[PDB]
Amino acid sequence: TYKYVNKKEQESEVDMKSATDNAARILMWTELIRGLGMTLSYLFREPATINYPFEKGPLSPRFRGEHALRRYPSGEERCIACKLCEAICPAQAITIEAEPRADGSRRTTRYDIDMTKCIYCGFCQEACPVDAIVEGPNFEFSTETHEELLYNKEKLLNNGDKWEAEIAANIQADYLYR
Amino acid sequence: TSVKPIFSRDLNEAKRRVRELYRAWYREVPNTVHLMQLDITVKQGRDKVREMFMKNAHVTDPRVVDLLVIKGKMELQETIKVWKQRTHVMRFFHETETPRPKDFLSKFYMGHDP
Amino acid sequence: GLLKKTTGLVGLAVCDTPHERLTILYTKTLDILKHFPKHAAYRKYTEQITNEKLDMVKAEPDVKKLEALLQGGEVEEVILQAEKELSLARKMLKWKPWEPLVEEPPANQWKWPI
Amino acid sequence: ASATRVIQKLRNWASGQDLQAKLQLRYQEIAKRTQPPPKLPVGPSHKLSNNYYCTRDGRREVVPPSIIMSSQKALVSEKKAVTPAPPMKRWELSKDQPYL
Amino acid sequence: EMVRKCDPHIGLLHRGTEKLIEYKTYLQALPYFDRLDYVSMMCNEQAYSIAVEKLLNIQPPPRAQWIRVLFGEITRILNHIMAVTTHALDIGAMTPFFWMFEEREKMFEFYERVSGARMHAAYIRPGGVHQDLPLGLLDDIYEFSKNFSLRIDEVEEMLTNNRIWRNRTVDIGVVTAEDALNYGFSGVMLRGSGIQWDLRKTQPYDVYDQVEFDVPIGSRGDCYDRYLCRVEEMRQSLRIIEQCLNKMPPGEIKVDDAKVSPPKRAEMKTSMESLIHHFKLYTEGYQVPPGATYTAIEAPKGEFGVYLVSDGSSRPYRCKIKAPGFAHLAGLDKMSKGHMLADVVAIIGTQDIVFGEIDR
Amino acid sequence: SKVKQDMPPPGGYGPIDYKRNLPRRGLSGYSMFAVGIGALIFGYW
Amino acid sequence: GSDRSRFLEGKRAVEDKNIGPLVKTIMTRCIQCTRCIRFASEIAGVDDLGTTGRGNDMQVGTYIEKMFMSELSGNVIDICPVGALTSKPYAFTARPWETRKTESIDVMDAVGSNIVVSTRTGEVMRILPRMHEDINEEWISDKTR
Amino acid sequence: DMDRFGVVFRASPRQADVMIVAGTLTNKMAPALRKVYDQMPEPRYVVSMGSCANGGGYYHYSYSVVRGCDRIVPVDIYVPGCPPTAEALLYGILQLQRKIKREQKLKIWYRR
Amino acid sequence: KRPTVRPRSDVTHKQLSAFGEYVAEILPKYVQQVQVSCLDELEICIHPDGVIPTLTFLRDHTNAQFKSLADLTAVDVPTRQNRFEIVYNLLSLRFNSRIRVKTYADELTPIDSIVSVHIAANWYEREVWDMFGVFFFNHPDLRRILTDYGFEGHPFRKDFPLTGYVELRYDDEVKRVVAEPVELAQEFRKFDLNSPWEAFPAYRQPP
Amino acid sequence: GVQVSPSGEKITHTGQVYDEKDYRRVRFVDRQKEVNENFAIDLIAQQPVNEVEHRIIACDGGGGALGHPKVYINLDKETKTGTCGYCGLQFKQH
Amino acid sequence: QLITVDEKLDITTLTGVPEEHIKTRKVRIFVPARNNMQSGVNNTKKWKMEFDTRERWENPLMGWASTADPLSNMVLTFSAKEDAIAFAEKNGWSYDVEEKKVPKPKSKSYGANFSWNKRTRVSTK
Ligand SMILES: CCCCCCCCCCCCCCCCCC(=O)OC[C@H](COP(=O)(O)OCCN)OC(=O)CCCCCCCCCCCCCCCCC
Ligand code: SF4
Ligand code: SF4
Ligand code: SF4
Ligand code: SF4
Ligand code: SF4
Ligand SMILES: [Zn+2]
């Protein structure tokens, strides 16, 4: 079905009353006083803004931000260098170089993320079979140097040891959906 | 053998268009060094024109020559107008790339490349 | 019935006198298709179409019933299509599409996957 | 929510209509932010029996495209004219609001 | 100060998305579509998903289709807010922008609660949908929809019966229907000239046959008609959101075929089959059969199209993307004839123009 | 346990308004012109 | 194959074997195909590899601790389609999609065994055989791999 | 709201103190960026915004992309994201404020 | 009836096969290999000389009012000597249908242009020339669109590298955005993903 | 295991440290190198063996769908003990 | 009408590449060998055309692998061989063609494993 937006049904009915009304629309700007009144109404409403550093925007557990490399509750490193977080990374941001650890364990000697190539898509954390790399809540990690945004294993593990108290909760909230 | 043409029955009728294009470029260079304030002399601009022409003198297929004439007319359009800036024009000169050594022993001193 | 002061399409006038312009255009198509050869298919199919639509015009004089019977939208769209089919008939008279296939392709041309 | 009942009146008059009911902001009529856990359901093909992937494969039910008038082979292209489909039936004018 | 010729030199958001897509998989290539038209994100990935589904001979389930059409209409309201308010900024009226970008922030909260990204949510996948929407979200969409009518009424009160807006949009950008068709326009640029056409009606792709709405059409091809058409498209998208909320059936959200769509996170931790399938899906892909398609949807700008070409491999061989805005910009020079710099500015704003899809 | 999927409630949702509502308001125009001319004549006197 | 497990029972788990410094046996995943005993008996001529028991409890390998240490022993790593036995030098290093593959030859012996050298970001990760029937009949020595 | 902080746009680069590279920088649009940065009158600052501008981003390996605005304009502050939440861009702007707060110019002039 | 697979009809297939016979027998001087796919998308393949007549036919014929150009693509297949497969997606709006006309080309076998039929083809032909190197006869402008002005190369050709042959950066020595050759700090990592198993026997190529 | 080298740099769990003559120590001037102090080798060594009764058991992380895939470990050997591939926990039977 | 062009089809003046990667470069036309890990052979059957490899080096910051050539990740596919020679001769690349390696057919017998006289009598099962 369709409908017309600017098609007059039919014309040619005018008397002195309608002429007066149109001539008073003109010469008084009556359809402009309505815009003035609208903007005046908006002057007396509560503004939608927030004192940002002190009160902030609402986010959800699914929110995907800064990355982190997680650990088990035993402190054991949770990644195993299965090397598919970089298989699927559609920006080729992730590199891995892996070896046995001298304990006899599949673990990494390298986990880099050029966060200037990352598109923050979540594919790595929904591809990891062990919930090792995640995309956490921190969106406030701006820098004054390009080289700082090129991460490695130690920075990601620092993030994990920092944000575990948040990431564990976000995961607890969002699983049963993923 | 037994192929279709484009704009050229033969190679001489293509060299005709080639010379028309060389002419347009020769007559355009003094206006391009003036309109957008290039920092070169008209002599070496026209030498660059002849260089980028003799970069393709080995060719004998008329069709390739016609396509090169077409692309030259495109670049000439872009240069007659100021759709392209001083950056693009001075791109031709390679004013920052060190000369590729055309000698064996230099290549051997730096790099595994031939 | 009436004159339908507003055809909904923009740039399209109204043609106060339909049932004549269509006769003109379809008769012209029929008279030009006689120059096509018999074995051609465009001749046959366009003759079928124009005869059916001419019969529709001859039958129904009401513009609305004519539209609903002649599924081409408003009558002015139908007239535009008749003019454009006529233009096509002339162009096809010049092109000779009915000839056999010219220069069948190489074998691995439409084969996919490769 | 706090507009002292006379500024509420001013804004509702200057606007033209009650907006204390339809506000731009959100106070307590929103879905809260910590919730119960779900139990997401499970689609068919979890039948546990009478479910073989050869029977409900779609990615294999395709064929290479059918062919008419291949110049390679010897295929041949009274006969009534044809359309690619019947003409698209005209749209009907709306009933809730035809002339805005 | 009046225009005799327009030569748009686009090429400044040309990256090479099509070549990179040829080099990526079908899942790796999805966020490019979020990033092509970057104010109507979920619709682009909806188109891509539909095309890959057609190549796979697979359909998603009811719930996924319903939430897909829901978020498609949400994208329509996003981009129509964007277009209308940017057009107004260009013409001089700046308050609708600030009034409606709050509503866009609420919509981004919907995106960020469903996905975890405000804008570039890779939520519409080929096999249905990634993640089921959380508890307590349809209530919020309802609470938004019940008041968005008032918001759009405020904007319409400001600048529909106005004189400056009318004098500045009316008899501007006039297009004949034949010119629109020949130049290649689509969507609103057709319906403003009065061409009854909408793929949501003619070529319905998810559930649009199952939901009712009206298509606004204009009688003059001026900017004013195809402004009111956008406003009424926003209202009708709201009408459809009502229905999509009132019926959102239970069930799986992605295709229950683990050779195309990945399994549940717990199913890939007790079963070996589903782990194999996780592995191959997230490292190699799913090997769509050879063939090709052209699939088109009503993007909020017009006919967003994708011509995919394939092979047994897990990657695409060619993926051209039709951009509504390409043909509009081609027709810019025609539409600006006897007009001025300001009217040309308004004509740019009227096309609902965005260059990630044009240059791409 | 049984399923839970954020379906709508039992009884659908309320009716969402979508039609345009710009309220016709204002005086007649005869009244406005009378006020104007009356102010004008009083001012002249 | 199907895409779902209708298996709701506990798996098994098999004792692993310490052959040697090359072949890394993880036999919780052997599919009992006997493609290895046949190689060791018919091509390497060793006959120190078999099957112990029957049922699910059949365990491929030796009944004892024995270094399966032959000049054609690393070929089982290519033979075993499953990763029940892999190589220890390549252990946990790379993955096949990462690897570029250049068809080269061998220089250890004068046999001319055709070979594939697999790289990963400018390094060398592993060696593999090529197929040539006049030389290197899908097999290569343990040195050159 | 940015104007809350005294941060309002101006269309001309000469009435501007900072430029925010909010998008992908191509080989065709880099001369224009540099002309604009040049025309900006010093003191002037740059904020690279997004992965496409910090580095090359999702279009790093393409033929028509410069792999960072670092190569064309000197960046003071990098904001990551695809897109970066406006919350995050705001954080980066206040971080640029903090950077300006510790410039110590007249100090070093006295110490010349 | 099966939910996971896509539903299937036959009337569209039959309609499009009929219309394919229609075009095939009405336009034999040019037409090759009409075909209709599993998904019902009609696809006519054409000799490059037949472009204007076929497109004018499908635009202006009464039973085929394909008067809207949706796309105009090209597809590089280095194997076949005529590389570039050129595609014309159209729609009717009278019959609610689409069609696809195809031709072929090469680096030195150009094609007549279509602005005389579909003005929408202007910028698409420009894009095709820029991306693949197909020259179009009697075109008004036919300059680049998308590539930089000083740009040598047709990028969407399969033999063109993804990263290109030149890279840009600003230099203080000359105060310009110079173009140096290409030198990346991280090589693009090509992945060998294709599986060594016949997934689809229906497309099995025999030797 | 954050023992240092004689060049003063911390050494990582991937024993990485730059040589003395390696010029790439510049970048840590007026700066430091991020290294994680909590080594997983020593930590998972600081974890006792979970004795069991059966010869075959399973291991996930402990959350179920929040750990790792279920794997089974044999415990017939007595000289050594079982070990998980994903985690590094150990098991034994009496 | 037609033309009689004799000389070799040459396109290098159109392709927009430097003289370097045209003349210096070498090309390998081949069918790739099957991965001896997998018993599948579908990754064969298509003639490919790779380029010579060039210097990669450790990036001094992180250790990534860098390049100075763009033809590194370059691979094309051809249904046949003459197509590949044609494409290479056309684009001006010197090529080396490795012929098609096909496995010998072989006479299998499950009964030879249980012979009375032969050495095929396998000691296992
Ligand atoms: C005793 C007998 C004799 C008595 C004699 C007196 C008889 C009565 C005289 C009444 C005349 C009143 C003056 C009217 C002048 C305006 C004339 C007019 O028609 O409007 C002009 C303009 C036209 O609008 P448009 O719809 O396009 O119609 C034109 C079609 N030709 O419309 C416009 O101008 C609008 C564009 C300007 C918008 C600017 C924003 C205005 C905002 C309103 C603020 C009002 C505040 C005024 C306060 C003043 C205090 C000093
Ligand atoms: S997917 Fe997870 S376990 Fe595998 S390499 Fe990446 S982070 Fe490590
Ligand atoms: S979020 Fe996406 S782009 Fe970023 S590292 Fe993970 S997979 Fe790569
Ligand atoms: S080849 Fe591998 S899978 Fe087959 S029996 Fe030997 S160890 Fe088991
Ligand atoms: S990759 Fe193959 S062999 Fe290895 S665990 Fe998985 S299914 Fe078993
Ligand atoms: S949102 Fe992402 S794709 Fe878009 S410009 Fe920013 S970084 Fe690039
Ligand atoms: Zn474990």
A39 close contact with H: CB closer than 8 A? no
The two structure tokens encoding residue G41: 């008996």
> How distant is the Cα of F40 from the closest Cα of chain E, in angstroms?
27
Structural domain boundaries, residue K90? 1-125
> Measured between alpha carbons, how far is E167 from C42 in angstroms, rounded to an integer?
50
Q: Do A98 and G93 touch (CB under 8 A)?
A: yes
* Residue A132, ligand 2, Cβ within 6 A: yes
Say whether J17 sits in a helix, a strand or coil: coil
Atom 4, ligand 4: residue with shortest CA distance: G33
Question: Which ligand lies nearest the alpha carbon of G83?
Answer: 5
Report the relative pairing of strands I98-104 and I111-112 from DSSP bridges.
unpaired
DSSP readout, A5-35? Answer: SS--S------HHHHHHHHHHTTTTHHHHHH
Residue ID of nearest Cα to ligand 5 atom 3: G82
- Between the CA of A26 and the centroid of ligand 1 the distance, in Å, is 7
Cα(G101) to ligand 2 centroid in Å equals 24
Instruction: Report how far apart, in Å, the C-alpha atoms of A64 and of each of A88, A157, E113 are.
Output: 17, 17, 11
Q: Which long-range contacts (CB under 8 A, 24 or more apart) does E98-101 make?
A: E99/A42, E99/E151, E99/E154, E99/E155, E100/E151, E100/E155
Ligand 6 neighbours by CB, cut-off 6 Å: A 119; E 35, 38; H 23-24, 50-52, 57-58, 82-83
The CA A130 to ligand 7 mean position distance, Å, reads 10
- Closest residue in C to I54 (Cα–Cα): C97
Elucidation technique = cryo-EM
How many structural domains are present in chain K? 1
Start-end of H helices in E93-247? 95-114, 138-159, 164-169, 177-183, 188-191, 199-202, 225-246
Residues of I in contact with A147 (CB under 8 A): none
CB–CB contact A83 G95 (8 Å): yes
- Enclosing domain of residue G124: 95-145
Number of structural domains (chain E) is 1
Residue by residue, DSSP assigns G53-108 as: SSGGG-EEE-SS------SS-TTHHHH-SSTTEEESTTTTT--GGG-EEEEEE--S
Question: Among J64, J65, J69, whose Cβ lies nearest the Cβ of E275?
Answer: J69
Residue of F nearest to D36 (CA): F4
Contact I169 H71 (CB under 8 A): yes
C-alpha of residue E263 to centroid of ligand 4, in Å: 29
Instruction: Locate the domains of chain J by residue range.
Output: 1-94
Residue type, A83: K
Residue B100: give the domain boundaries. Answer: 1-114
Chain E partners (3+ C-beta pairs within 8 A):
A, C, D, F, G, H, I, J
Task: Answer whether J81's CB lies under 8 Å from J49's CB.
Answer: yes
- Number of compact structural domains in chain B: 1
Which residues 19-78 on chain C approach chain I with CB closer than 8 angstroms?
41-42, 45-46, 49, 72-73
Tell me the nearest-neighbour CA distance from E67 into chain C, angstroms: 35
C-alpha span between J10 and J17 (Å, rounded): 7
E300 close to E324: Cβ distance less than 8 angstroms: no
Closest chain J residue by Cα to residue E265: J65
Would you call K86 an interface residue with chain I, using a CB distance cutoff of 8 Å? yes
- Closest alpha carbon within chain E to D43: E252
Q: How many residues does chain A have?
A: 178
Q: What is the dihedral of CA A31, A32, A38, A39, to 10 degrees?
A: 170
Task: Work out the end-to-end distance of chain C between its first and last CA atoms, rounded to an integer number of angstroms.
Answer: 62
Let me know: does C5 contact C14? Beta carbons within 8 Å: yes
The answer to whether I24 and C49 are in contact (CB under 8 A) is no
Q: How far is CA E47 from CA E285, E304, I24, I111, K83, in A?
A: 19, 7, 32, 31, 36
- Assess contact for E356 and E53: CB atoms under 8 A: no
Rounded Cα–Cα distance for residues E314 and E288 (Å): 6
Determine the residue of chain E that is closest to A139 in CA distance. Answer: E117
CB C39 within 8 A of CB C96: no
Q: Which candidate from A3, A6, A173 shows the least CB-CB separation from D93?
A: A3
Task: Please report which residue ranges of I133-187 form alpha helices under DSSP H.
Answer: none
What's the CA gap between G106 and G128, in Å, rounded?
11
CA R_g for chain B? 18
CA distance G26 to K48: 37
Q: Which protein residues touch ligand 4 with a CB less than 6 Å away? A: G 30-36, 60, 79-80, 82, 84-85
Place of tokens 């601790």: G65
* Neighboring chain F residues of E157 at a CB cutoff of 8 Å: 22
- Is H10 in a helix, a strand, or coil? coil
Structural domains for chain H:
1-112 (3.40.50.12280)
Contact list in H for residue I148 (CB cut-off 8 A) is 26-28, 64
Neighbors of chain F with 3 or more C-beta pairs under 8 Å = A, D, E
Substitution site in A114, A119, A125, A135 for ligand 3 pocket (most atoms within 8 Å of beta carbon): A119
User: K65: which chain G residues are within 8 Å (Cβ-Cβ)?
Assistant: 121-122
Q: Tokens in use for E263?
A: 């399994």
Q: Which residues in E lie closer than 8 A to residue J87 (C-beta atoms)?
A: none
Say if the Cβ atoms of H28 and E120 lie within 8 Å: no
> Distances in Å between the alpha carbon of E139 and those of C29, E242, E264, F14?
63, 11, 27, 11
C-alpha to C-alpha distance for E207 and E236, rounded to whole angstroms: 15
Max Cα separation, chain I?
Answer: 71
Find chain A residues with C-beta within 8 A of F32's C-beta.
Answer: 24, 28
Q: Is B76 on the interface with I (CB under 8 A)?
A: no
Pairing verdict, β K94-97 and K26-30: parallel
Q: Which two tokens stand for residue E315?
A: 């990657």
The number of residues in chain G equals 145
Instruction: Give the integer Cα–Cα distance in Å for K72 and K50.
Output: 9
- Cβ within 8 Å, pair G10-J56: yes
Q: Which residue has the tokens 């960026």?
A: H33
Q: Please, what is the Cα angle at G54 between G49 and G59, to 5 degrees?
A: 40
Query: For residue A81, which phi and psi values (nearest 5 degrees)?
Result: 60, 45
The closest residue, in CA terms, to atom 1 on ligand 4 is G80
**Strand, helix or coil for residue G131:** strand
Closest CB to C48 among D71, D72, D80: D80
The tokens of E13 are what? 């958001």
- Spell out the domain ranges in chain C: 1-114
Could you give the CA distance from residue A63 to residue E282 in angstroms, rounded to a whole number?
Answer: 21
Question: Looking at residue E78, which CATH number applies to its domain?
Answer: 1.10.645.10
E189 forms bridges with which residues in the sheet?
Answer: none
Residue span of the structural domain in which E151 resides: 1-360
For the stretch E38-41, contacts whose Cβ atoms lie closer than 8 Å and that sit 24 or more positions apart, written own/partner, are E38/E119, E38/E120, E38/E354, E38/E356, E39/E75, E39/E78, E39/E79, E39/E82, E39/E354, E40/E75, E40/E76, E40/E78, E40/E79, E40/E299, E40/E300, E40/E301, E41/E75, E41/E119, E41/E120, E41/E121
Q: Is K82 on the interface with B (CB under 8 A)?
A: no
- Determine the residue type at H86: A
Select the residue of A87, A92, A114 nearest I188 (Cβ to Cβ).
A92
Cα-to-chain-centroid distance, residue C55: 14
Tokens linked to G104: 């080269």
List CB contacts (< 8 A) between I187 and chain G. 121
